[PDB]
Design a protein around this ligand. Structure first.
Ligand SMILES: CC(=O)N[C@H]1[C@H]([C@H](O)[C@H](O)CO)C[C@@H](C(=O)O)C[C@@H]1O
Length: 379
């Protein structure tokens, strides 16, 4: 009823030379997977990115970005590494926390994946606020134009726009999926760690692009909260849905990121309890209306176990919220649990709703398409 995308202590990857990557999982396997991001193409192909945390679940560890590709509706997966860390520090070199977009970029169907990159930092990224930006940090972008078979680095101006801003120590995607707007614009939700002198330590915002190469930052910022976030398009607004300890937060911008105000249909509607968790938020059409589909954890133990990863529908008109499916009704592994990513498409006349999520160090997939009539009615 599920499939396993990446099995904890059950995968072997190879490096750029073709030599095996001996992780710390039993038999030299990759120890742990975290932070899934899924993008489905017009061909029905499913690509799932995740951190391959070869040695430990820790954020501060040796990590590559794995990619799993399914052309049979999520039954089987071909796996590889999409992005290798720089291999400076065998303990700490890492690429992590993917955000993906599937888009037609001036006609060309492309999967983009953006990850943060560190080498020698031994502490969490929010600790490094002395520089503009941190010298250990980067934010890299890879593309596939062959339906997810191969990924190549995109040379961008993302590092430059962060430096020129001068008030950002580091930036990361919002985690899970970004979006292509109706007009074609590419949008990644972002998280920012501000330089020490900025009283907000954290903010949310987005970067945008037409061609995937040259990106821009808006002049304004949204409050950070727990900073992981996704954006949806709703009329002329961009609307975010942000991790927060306790009740999730949602703001709208009507001026393309200059100012943000609370968005009542989603603000404070889902409780993730202590510490918060990443959540995935997307839209699903229902006639010429929209419904937001959202996944995050109920967290019944009020801790890092992040139990009960659940799908909700948000009525974007009335503000009602309901539980559609507690699709992972289990207590997670507090080493790292709870994260998810949704993906909706209508290809021809076939609508699909998929989810991937963290399951005891593995990444699982479910086809949630049976729930579409319920979600679509929720307008
Ligand atoms: C870059 C980084 O540290 N990201 C991590 C996140 C980060 O440490 C926090 O958001 C604080 O910046 C949190 C997190 C979790 O809560 O499970 C996992 C995620 O990989």
């Amino acid at each position: 009823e599920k499939s396993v995308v990446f099995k904890a202590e059950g995968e072997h990857f190879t490096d750029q030379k073709g030599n095996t990557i001996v992780g710390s999982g039993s038999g030299g396997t990759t120890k742990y997977f975290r932070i899934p991001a899924m993008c489905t193409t017009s061909k029905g192909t499913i690509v799932v990115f995740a951190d391959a945390r070869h040695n430990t679940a820790s954020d501060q560890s040796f990590i590559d970005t794995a990619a799993a590709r399914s052309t049979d509706g999520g039954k089987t997966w071909n796996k590889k590494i999409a992005i290798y860390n720089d291999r400076v520090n065998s303990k700490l070199s890492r690429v992590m926390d993917p955000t993906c977009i599937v888009a037609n970029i001036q006609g060309r169907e492309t999967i983009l994946v953006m990850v943060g990159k560190w080498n020698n930092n031994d502490k969490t990224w929010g600790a490094y606020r002395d520089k503009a930006p941190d010298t250990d940090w980067d934010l890299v972008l890879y593309k596939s134009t062959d339906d997810g078979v191969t990924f190549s680095k995109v040379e961008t101006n993302i590092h430059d726009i962060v430096t020129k801003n001068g008030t950002i120590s580091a930036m990361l995607g919002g985690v899970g999926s970004g979006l292509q707007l109706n007009d074609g614009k590419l949008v990644f939700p972002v998280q920012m760690v501000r330089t020490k002198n900025i009283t907000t330590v954290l903010n949310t915002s987005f970067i945008y692009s037409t061609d995937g190469i040259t990106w821009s930052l808006p002049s304004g910022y949204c409050e950070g909260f727990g900073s992981e976030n996704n954006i949806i398009e709703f009329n002329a607004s961009l609307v975010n849905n942000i991790r927060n300890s306790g009740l999730r937060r949602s703001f709208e911008t009507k001026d393309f990121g200059k100012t943000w105000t609370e968005f009542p249909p989603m603000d404070k509607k889902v409780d993730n309890r202590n510490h918060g968790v990443q959540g995935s938020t997307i839209t699903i059409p229902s006639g010429n209306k929209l419904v937001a589909a959202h996944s995050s954890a109920q967290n019944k133990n009020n801790d890092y176990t992040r139990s009960d990863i659940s799908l909700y529908a948000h009525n974007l008109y009335s503000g009602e919220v309901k539980l559609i499916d507690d699709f992972y009704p289990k207590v997670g592994n507090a080493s790292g649990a709870g994260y998810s990513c949704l993906s909706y498409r209508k290809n021809v006349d076939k609508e699909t709703l998929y989810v991937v999520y963290e399951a005891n160090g593995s990444i699982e997939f479910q086809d949630l398409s049976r729930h579409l009539p319920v979600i679509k009615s929720y307008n």
